[PDB]
Amino acid sequence: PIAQIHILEGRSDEQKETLIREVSEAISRSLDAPLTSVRVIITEMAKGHFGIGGELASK
Amino acid sequence: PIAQIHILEGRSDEQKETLIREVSEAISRSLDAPLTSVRVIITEMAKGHFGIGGELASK
Amino acid sequence: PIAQIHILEGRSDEQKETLIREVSEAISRSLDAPLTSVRVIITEMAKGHFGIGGELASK
Amino acid sequence: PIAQIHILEGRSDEQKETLIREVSEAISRSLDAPLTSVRVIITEMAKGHFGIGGELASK
Amino acid sequence: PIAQIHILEGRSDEQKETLIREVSEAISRSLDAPLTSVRVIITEMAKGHFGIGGELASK
Amino acid sequence: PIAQIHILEGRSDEQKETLIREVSEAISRSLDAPLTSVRVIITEMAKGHFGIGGELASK
Numbered sequence: 001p002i003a004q005i006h007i008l009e010g011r012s013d014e015q016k017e018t019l020i021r022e023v024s025e026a027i028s029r030s031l032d033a034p035l036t037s038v039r040v041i042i043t044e045m046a047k048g049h050f051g052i053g054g055e056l057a058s059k
Numbered sequence: 060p061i062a063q064i065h066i067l068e069g070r071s072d073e074q075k076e077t078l079i080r081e082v083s084e085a086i087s088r089s090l091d092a093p094l095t096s097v098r099v100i101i102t103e104m105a106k107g108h109f110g111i112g113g114e115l116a117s118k
Numbered sequence: 119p120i121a122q123i124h125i126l127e128g129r130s131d132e133q134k135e136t137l138i139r140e141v142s143e144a145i146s147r148s149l150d151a152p153l154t155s156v157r158v159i160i161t162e163m164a165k166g167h168f169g170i171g172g173e174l175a176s177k
Numbered sequence: 178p179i180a181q182i183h184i185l186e187g188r189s190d191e192q193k194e195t196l197i198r199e200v201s202e203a204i205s206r207s208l209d210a211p212l213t214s215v216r217v218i219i220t221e222m223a224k225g226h227f228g229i230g231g232e233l234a235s236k
Numbered sequence: 237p238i239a240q241i242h243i244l245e246g247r248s249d250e251q252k253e254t255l256i257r258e259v260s261e262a263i264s265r266s267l268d269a270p271l272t273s274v275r276v277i278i279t280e281m282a283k284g285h286f287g288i289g290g291e292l293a294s295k
Numbered sequence: 296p297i298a299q300i301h302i303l304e305g306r307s308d309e310q311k312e313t314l315i316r317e318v319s320e321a322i323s324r325s326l327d328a329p330l331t332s333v334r335v336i337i338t339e340m341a342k343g344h345f346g347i348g349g350e351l352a353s354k
Contacts, residue, residue, distance in 0.1 A: 002238065002275065003082070006061040006218060011090060013343055019089035020346035023062070026085035028349075030078035031070060039238065039275070040346035041301060043220075043338075048190055051197035051217035054205075061179065061216065063124075065240075065277060072166055079169035087172075098179065098216070099169035100124060102161075102279075107249055110256035110276035113264075120183040120297065120334065121200070122242075129208060131284055137207035138287035141180070144203035146290075148196035149188060157297065157334070158287035159242060161279075183336060220338075225308055228315035228335035231323075238301040239318070247326060255325035259298070262321035266314035267306060 001027050002039045008057055009044045016042055060086050063100040067109060067116055075101055119145050122159040126168060126175055134160055178204050179216045185234055186221045193219055237263050240277040244286060244293055252278055296322050297334045303352055304339045311337055 003023060011019075020040045028035040047058035062082060070078075079099045087094040109116035121141060129137075138158045146153040168175035180200060188196075197217045205212040224235035239259060247255075256276045264271040286293035298318060306314075315335045323330040342353035 002065040002277070004063050005086065007090065015090065016343065017351055019086065020351060021349050022085040022089040023082055024346055024349040026081040027064065027078065030081040031066065031074065036348040038346070038348060041238070041340055042344040042346075043340075044344075045218055045220075048193065049219040049221075051201055051215070051219075053213040053215060054198050054201040056194055056197060061218070075166065076174055079174065080172045083169055083172040095171040097169070097171060100163055100179070101167040101169075102163075103167075104277055104279075107252065108278040108280075110260055110274070110278075112272040112274060113257045113260040115253055115256065120336070122181050123204065124179040125208065133208065134284065135292055137204065138292065139290045140203040140207040141200055142287055142290040144199040145182065145196065148199040149184065149192065154289040156287070156289060159281055159297070160285040160287075161281075162285075222336055222338075225311065226337040226339075228319055228333070228337075230331040230333060231316050231319040233312055233315060240299050241322065242297040243326065251326065255322065258321040258325040259318055262317040263300065263314065266317040267302065267310065 001031060001033055001037065002041070003027060004041045004043060006043050006045055008050060009046055060090060060092055060096065061098045061100070062086060063102060065102050065104055068103045068105055119149060119151055119155065120157045120159070121145060122161060124161050124163055127162045127164055178208060178210055178214065179218070180204060181218045181220060183220050183222055185227060186223055237267060237269055237273065238275045238277070239263060240279060242279050242281055245280045245282055296326060296328055296332065297336070298322060299336045299338060301338050301340055303345060304341055 024038045027038050050057035083097045086097050106117035142156045145156050165176035201215045204215050227234035260274045263274050283294035319333045322333050345352035
Protein backbone atom coordinates (compact mmCIF):
# COMPACT_ATOMS: atom_id res chain seq x y z
CA PRO A 1 0.00 0.00 0.00
CA ILE A 2 1.16 3.50 -0.80
CA ALA A 3 -0.28 6.55 0.83
CA GLN A 4 0.36 10.18 -0.18
CA ILE A 5 -0.95 12.70 2.41
CA HIS A 6 -1.23 16.39 1.54
CA ILE A 7 -0.91 18.67 4.55
CA LEU A 8 -0.50 22.45 5.02
CA GLU A 9 2.97 23.62 5.99
CA GLY A 10 3.51 24.32 9.71
CA ARG A 11 3.81 21.05 11.64
CA SER A 12 6.90 20.02 13.59
CA ASP A 13 9.16 17.11 12.64
CA GLU A 14 7.89 15.08 15.63
CA GLN A 15 4.32 15.72 14.54
CA LYS A 16 4.98 14.47 11.04
CA GLU A 17 7.02 11.52 12.30
CA THR A 18 3.98 10.61 14.41
CA LEU A 19 1.59 11.03 11.49
CA ILE A 20 3.72 8.68 9.39
CA ARG A 21 3.71 6.03 12.13
CA GLU A 22 0.00 6.30 12.99
CA VAL A 23 -1.30 6.29 9.43
CA SER A 24 1.10 3.45 8.60
CA GLU A 25 -0.30 1.21 11.35
CA ALA A 26 -3.91 2.13 10.47
CA ILE A 27 -3.35 0.91 6.91
CA SER A 28 -1.55 -2.17 8.06
CA ARG A 29 -4.24 -3.34 10.45
CA SER A 30 -7.13 -2.19 8.27
CA LEU A 31 -5.95 -4.30 5.36
CA ASP A 32 -4.09 -6.98 7.31
CA ALA A 33 -1.04 -6.14 5.21
CA PRO A 34 2.52 -6.42 6.57
CA LEU A 35 3.66 -3.03 7.98
CA THR A 36 6.99 -3.41 6.19
CA SER A 37 5.12 -3.10 2.87
CA VAL A 38 3.50 0.22 3.74
CA ARG A 39 4.96 3.37 2.17
CA VAL A 40 3.91 6.86 3.20
CA ILE A 41 4.72 10.18 1.53
CA ILE A 42 3.98 13.53 3.10
CA THR A 43 3.56 16.49 0.78
CA GLU A 44 3.34 19.90 2.44
CA MET A 45 1.34 22.67 0.78
CA ALA A 46 2.16 26.35 1.26
CA LYS A 47 -0.83 28.13 2.80
CA GLY A 48 -1.08 29.95 -0.53
CA HIS A 49 -1.10 26.76 -2.56
CA PHE A 50 -4.32 25.34 -1.15
CA GLY A 51 -7.77 26.48 -2.19
CA ILE A 52 -11.03 25.67 -0.40
CA GLY A 53 -14.22 26.85 -2.02
CA GLY A 54 -12.20 29.23 -4.18
CA GLU A 55 -10.52 30.99 -1.24
CA LEU A 56 -6.92 30.49 -0.18
CA ALA A 57 -6.18 28.28 2.81
CA SER A 58 -4.28 31.16 4.37
CA LYS A 59 -7.27 33.53 4.46
CA PRO B 60 -5.56 17.02 5.04
CA ILE B 61 -6.04 14.91 1.94
CA ALA B 62 -4.83 11.34 1.69
CA GLN B 63 -4.76 9.23 -1.48
CA ILE B 64 -4.03 5.54 -0.79
CA HIS B 65 -3.06 3.17 -3.61
CA ILE B 66 -4.04 -0.43 -2.91
CA LEU B 67 -4.12 -3.59 -5.04
CA GLU B 68 -7.60 -4.71 -6.17
CA GLY B 69 -9.14 -7.51 -4.10
CA ARG B 70 -10.42 -6.14 -0.78
CA SER B 71 -14.06 -6.18 0.30
CA ASP B 72 -16.25 -3.10 0.69
CA GLU B 73 -16.21 -3.52 4.47
CA GLN B 74 -12.44 -3.74 4.42
CA LYS B 75 -12.11 -0.52 2.48
CA GLU B 76 -14.74 1.24 4.58
CA THR B 77 -12.67 0.29 7.63
CA LEU B 78 -9.45 1.49 5.97
CA ILE B 79 -11.05 4.87 5.25
CA ARG B 80 -12.21 5.23 8.89
CA GLU B 81 -8.97 4.07 10.51
CA VAL B 82 -6.63 6.10 8.35
CA SER B 83 -8.94 9.09 8.78
CA GLU B 84 -8.72 8.99 12.58
CA ALA B 85 -4.95 8.40 12.52
CA ILE B 86 -4.49 11.61 10.49
CA SER B 87 -6.90 13.54 12.69
CA ARG B 88 -5.26 12.65 15.99
CA SER B 89 -1.72 12.78 14.61
CA LEU B 90 -2.13 16.36 13.43
CA ASP B 91 -4.80 17.42 15.90
CA ALA B 92 -6.92 18.40 12.92
CA PRO B 93 -10.75 18.20 12.91
CA LEU B 94 -11.88 14.82 11.54
CA THR B 95 -14.48 16.63 9.43
CA SER B 96 -11.68 18.24 7.40
CA VAL B 97 -10.01 14.91 6.49
CA ARG B 98 -10.57 13.60 2.97
CA VAL B 99 -9.51 10.11 1.89
CA ILE B 100 -9.33 8.67 -1.63
CA ILE B 101 -8.79 5.01 -2.38
CA THR B 102 -7.32 4.09 -5.70
CA GLU B 103 -7.22 0.40 -6.58
CA MET B 104 -4.50 -0.96 -8.87
CA ALA B 105 -5.00 -4.00 -11.08
CA LYS B 106 -2.50 -6.70 -10.08
CA GLY B 107 -0.99 -6.10 -13.52
CA HIS B 108 -0.68 -2.35 -13.06
CA PHE B 109 1.71 -2.49 -10.11
CA GLY B 110 5.41 -3.17 -10.45
CA ILE B 111 7.85 -3.96 -7.66
CA GLY B 112 11.51 -4.21 -8.57
CA GLY B 113 10.54 -4.48 -12.22
CA GLU B 114 8.25 -7.52 -11.73
CA LEU B 115 4.46 -7.40 -11.80
CA ALA B 116 2.55 -7.41 -8.51
CA SER B 117 0.61 -10.42 -9.76
CA LYS B 118 3.68 -12.67 -10.19
CA PRO C 119 0.40 22.95 -16.70
CA ILE C 120 -1.06 19.59 -15.74
CA ALA C 121 -4.26 19.25 -13.76
CA GLN C 122 -5.62 16.03 -12.25
CA ILE C 123 -9.21 16.39 -10.98
CA HIS C 124 -10.75 13.75 -8.70
CA ILE C 125 -14.53 13.55 -9.03
CA LEU C 126 -17.14 11.08 -7.76
CA GLU C 127 -18.54 8.69 -10.39
CA GLY C 128 -21.93 9.69 -11.84
CA ARG C 129 -21.50 12.53 -14.34
CA SER C 130 -22.35 12.29 -18.02
CA ASP C 131 -19.81 12.35 -20.85
CA GLU C 132 -21.00 15.82 -21.87
CA GLN C 133 -20.59 17.03 -18.32
CA LYS C 134 -17.03 15.80 -18.13
CA GLU C 135 -16.19 17.12 -21.59
CA THR C 136 -17.42 20.51 -20.40
CA LEU C 137 -15.39 20.24 -17.17
CA ILE C 138 -12.25 19.52 -19.18
CA ARG C 139 -12.84 22.55 -21.45
CA GLU C 140 -13.78 24.99 -18.68
CA VAL C 141 -10.99 24.07 -16.30
CA SER C 142 -8.57 24.12 -19.23
CA GLU C 143 -9.43 27.71 -20.16
CA ALA C 144 -9.38 28.86 -16.52
CA ILE C 145 -5.78 27.59 -16.18
CA SER C 146 -4.77 29.10 -19.51
CA ARG C 147 -6.05 32.59 -18.80
CA SER C 148 -5.07 32.53 -15.13
CA LEU C 149 -1.43 31.81 -15.94
CA ASP C 150 -1.35 33.35 -19.40
CA ALA C 151 -0.13 30.00 -20.67
CA PRO C 152 -0.93 28.66 -24.17
CA LEU C 153 -4.09 26.51 -24.06
CA THR C 154 -2.32 23.93 -26.22
CA SER C 155 0.10 23.23 -23.36
CA VAL C 156 -2.65 22.47 -20.80
CA ARG C 157 -3.26 18.82 -19.96
CA VAL C 158 -6.24 17.67 -17.88
CA ILE C 159 -6.86 14.25 -16.33
CA ILE C 160 -10.15 13.22 -14.79
CA THR C 161 -10.10 10.49 -12.21
CA GLU C 162 -13.47 9.18 -11.04
CA MET C 163 -13.87 7.78 -7.52
CA ALA C 164 -16.42 5.12 -6.64
CA LYS C 165 -18.83 6.50 -4.03
CA GLY C 166 -17.29 3.91 -1.72
CA HIS C 167 -13.72 4.98 -2.39
CA PHE C 168 -14.09 8.51 -1.05
CA GLY C 169 -14.08 9.36 2.63
CA ILE C 170 -15.03 12.67 4.21
CA GLY C 171 -14.49 13.03 7.93
CA GLY C 172 -14.15 9.27 8.21
CA GLU C 173 -17.55 8.51 6.61
CA LEU C 174 -18.03 7.17 3.09
CA ALA C 175 -19.03 9.58 0.32
CA SER C 176 -21.99 7.33 -0.43
CA LYS C 177 -23.58 7.63 3.04
CA PRO D 178 -14.07 17.69 -6.27
CA ILE D 179 -10.35 17.85 -5.72
CA ALA D 180 -7.97 19.32 -8.23
CA GLN D 181 -4.16 19.11 -8.12
CA ILE D 182 -2.47 21.44 -10.68
CA HIS D 183 1.22 21.07 -11.48
CA ILE D 184 2.85 24.31 -12.61
CA LEU D 185 6.45 25.43 -13.20
CA GLU D 186 7.94 27.68 -10.54
CA GLY D 187 7.92 31.42 -11.33
CA ARG D 188 4.42 32.85 -10.92
CA SER D 189 3.51 35.56 -8.42
CA ASP D 190 1.26 35.02 -5.40
CA GLU D 191 -1.53 37.08 -7.04
CA GLN D 192 -1.25 34.94 -10.16
CA LYS D 193 -1.62 31.74 -8.20
CA GLU D 194 -4.40 33.17 -6.05
CA THR D 195 -6.21 33.96 -9.31
CA LEU D 196 -5.58 30.50 -10.72
CA ILE D 197 -7.06 28.94 -7.60
CA ARG D 198 -10.19 31.10 -7.86
CA GLU D 199 -10.70 30.67 -11.61
CA VAL D 200 -10.19 26.92 -11.73
CA SER D 201 -12.36 26.55 -8.63
CA GLU D 202 -15.32 28.31 -10.27
CA ALA D 203 -14.84 26.40 -13.55
CA ILE D 204 -15.17 23.10 -11.68
CA SER D 205 -18.10 24.34 -9.68
CA ARG D 206 -20.15 25.48 -12.65
CA SER D 207 -19.06 22.63 -14.92
CA LEU D 208 -20.29 20.02 -12.47
CA ASP D 209 -22.99 22.08 -10.75
CA ALA D 210 -21.25 21.28 -7.47
CA PRO D 211 -21.23 23.72 -4.53
CA LEU D 212 -18.08 25.91 -4.64
CA THR D 213 -17.54 25.32 -0.93
CA SER D 214 -16.85 21.65 -1.71
CA VAL D 215 -14.08 22.39 -4.21
CA ARG D 216 -10.48 21.88 -3.08
CA VAL D 217 -7.49 22.99 -5.13
CA ILE D 218 -3.82 22.19 -4.60
CA ILE D 219 -1.03 23.88 -6.50
CA THR D 220 2.24 22.01 -6.83
CA GLU D 221 5.15 23.97 -8.30
CA MET D 222 7.85 22.15 -10.25
CA ALA D 223 11.43 23.41 -10.44
CA LYS D 224 12.35 24.08 -14.08
CA GLY D 225 14.76 21.17 -13.69
CA HIS D 226 12.10 18.80 -12.39
CA PHE D 227 9.92 18.81 -15.49
CA GLY D 228 10.68 16.84 -18.63
CA ILE D 229 9.00 17.28 -22.01
CA GLY D 230 9.97 14.86 -24.74
CA GLY D 231 13.04 13.89 -22.73
CA GLU D 232 14.40 17.44 -22.45
CA LEU D 233 14.27 19.57 -19.33
CA ALA D 234 11.63 22.29 -19.07
CA SER D 235 14.39 24.80 -18.42
CA LYS D 236 16.17 24.21 -21.74
CA PRO E 237 11.62 5.63 -5.85
CA ILE E 238 7.95 5.54 -6.76
CA ALA E 239 6.69 6.24 -10.26
CA GLN E 240 3.05 6.71 -11.27
CA ILE E 241 2.55 6.73 -15.06
CA HIS E 242 -0.71 7.93 -16.60
CA ILE E 243 -1.44 6.32 -19.95
CA LEU E 244 -4.51 6.25 -22.22
CA GLU E 245 -6.49 2.98 -22.19
CA GLY E 246 -5.77 0.63 -25.11
CA ARG E 247 -2.44 -1.13 -24.57
CA SER E 248 -2.04 -4.88 -24.19
CA ASP E 249 -0.98 -6.63 -20.98
CA GLU E 250 2.39 -7.49 -22.54
CA GLN E 251 2.88 -3.88 -23.51
CA LYS E 252 2.22 -2.66 -19.99
CA GLU E 253 4.35 -5.41 -18.45
CA THR E 254 7.18 -4.22 -20.70
CA LEU E 255 6.57 -0.57 -19.75
CA ILE E 256 6.80 -1.47 -16.06
CA ARG E 257 10.10 -3.34 -16.58
CA GLU E 258 11.73 -0.74 -18.84
CA VAL E 259 10.79 2.29 -16.78
CA SER E 260 11.84 0.40 -13.65
CA GLU E 261 15.37 -0.24 -14.95
CA ALA E 262 15.71 3.32 -16.27
CA ILE E 263 15.00 4.68 -12.76
CA SER E 264 17.31 2.15 -11.14
CA ARG E 265 20.32 2.88 -13.31
CA SER E 266 19.66 6.61 -13.51
CA LEU E 267 19.72 6.99 -9.73
CA ASP E 268 21.94 4.03 -8.94
CA ALA E 269 19.16 2.78 -6.68
CA PRO E 270 18.48 -0.94 -6.06
CA LEU E 271 15.87 -2.22 -8.55
CA THR E 272 14.12 -4.00 -5.69
CA SER E 273 13.24 -0.62 -4.16
CA VAL E 274 11.53 0.71 -7.32
CA ARG E 275 7.73 0.75 -7.34
CA VAL E 276 5.71 1.51 -10.48
CA ILE E 277 1.99 2.25 -10.78
CA ILE E 278 0.14 2.41 -14.07
CA THR E 279 -3.02 4.43 -14.22
CA GLU E 280 -5.07 4.18 -17.40
CA MET E 281 -7.22 7.11 -18.53
CA ALA E 282 -10.38 6.67 -20.58
CA LYS E 283 -9.98 8.48 -23.91
CA GLY E 284 -12.71 10.78 -22.62
CA HIS E 285 -10.96 11.52 -19.35
CA PHE E 286 -7.90 13.15 -20.88
CA GLY E 287 -7.84 16.70 -22.17
CA ILE E 288 -5.14 18.32 -24.27
CA GLY E 289 -5.48 22.02 -24.99
CA GLY E 290 -9.11 21.85 -23.92
CA GLU E 291 -10.06 19.09 -26.42
CA LEU E 292 -10.69 15.46 -25.49
CA ALA E 293 -7.95 12.90 -26.11
CA SER E 294 -10.44 10.87 -28.12
CA LYS E 295 -11.12 13.59 -30.72
CA PRO F 296 2.05 9.64 -21.29
CA ILE F 297 2.68 11.44 -18.04
CA ALA F 298 5.00 10.13 -15.39
CA GLN F 299 5.40 11.50 -11.85
CA ILE F 300 8.45 10.03 -10.02
CA HIS F 301 8.85 10.48 -6.27
CA ILE F 302 12.47 10.46 -5.13
CA LEU F 303 14.25 11.30 -1.86
CA GLU F 304 16.11 14.60 -1.79
CA GLY F 305 19.87 14.41 -2.39
CA ARG F 306 20.61 13.80 -6.07
CA SER F 307 22.55 16.20 -8.27
CA ASP F 308 21.05 18.17 -11.15
CA GLU F 309 22.92 15.99 -13.69
CA GLN F 310 21.56 12.88 -12.02
CA LYS F 311 18.00 14.11 -12.25
CA GLU F 312 18.49 15.37 -15.80
CA THR F 313 19.64 11.84 -16.66
CA LEU F 314 16.70 10.24 -14.88
CA ILE F 315 14.30 12.41 -16.86
CA ARG F 316 15.94 11.42 -20.16
CA GLU F 317 16.22 7.70 -19.39
CA VAL F 318 12.72 7.22 -18.05
CA SER F 319 11.36 9.30 -20.93
CA GLU F 320 12.93 7.02 -23.56
CA ALA F 321 11.85 3.87 -21.69
CA ILE F 322 8.22 5.02 -21.84
CA SER F 323 8.53 6.05 -25.44
CA ARG F 324 9.92 2.77 -26.69
CA SER F 325 7.82 0.62 -24.36
CA LEU F 326 4.60 2.10 -25.67
CA ASP F 327 5.79 3.07 -29.14
CA ALA F 328 4.61 6.60 -28.36
CA PRO F 329 6.36 9.69 -29.78
CA LEU F 330 9.00 10.97 -27.31
CA THR F 331 7.74 14.53 -27.81
CA SER F 332 4.47 13.50 -26.12
CA VAL F 333 6.15 12.23 -22.96
CA ARG F 334 6.00 14.43 -19.86
CA VAL F 335 7.97 13.70 -16.70
CA ILE F 336 7.68 15.32 -13.28
CA ILE F 337 10.16 14.75 -10.49
CA THR F 338 8.95 15.29 -6.95
CA GLU F 339 11.61 15.20 -4.24
CA MET F 340 10.70 14.04 -0.74
CA ALA F 341 12.52 15.26 2.36
CA LYS F 342 14.07 12.30 4.17
CA GLY F 343 11.57 13.05 6.92
CA HIS F 344 8.60 13.01 4.59
CA PHE F 345 8.90 9.39 3.51
CA GLY F 346 7.78 6.45 5.61
CA ILE F 347 8.64 2.80 4.99
CA GLY F 348 7.03 0.25 7.25
CA GLY F 349 6.16 3.01 9.69
CA GLU F 350 9.75 4.25 10.09
CA LEU F 351 11.14 7.42 8.54
CA ALA F 352 13.28 7.15 5.42
CA SER F 353 16.01 9.06 7.23
CA LYS F 354 16.42 6.49 10.02
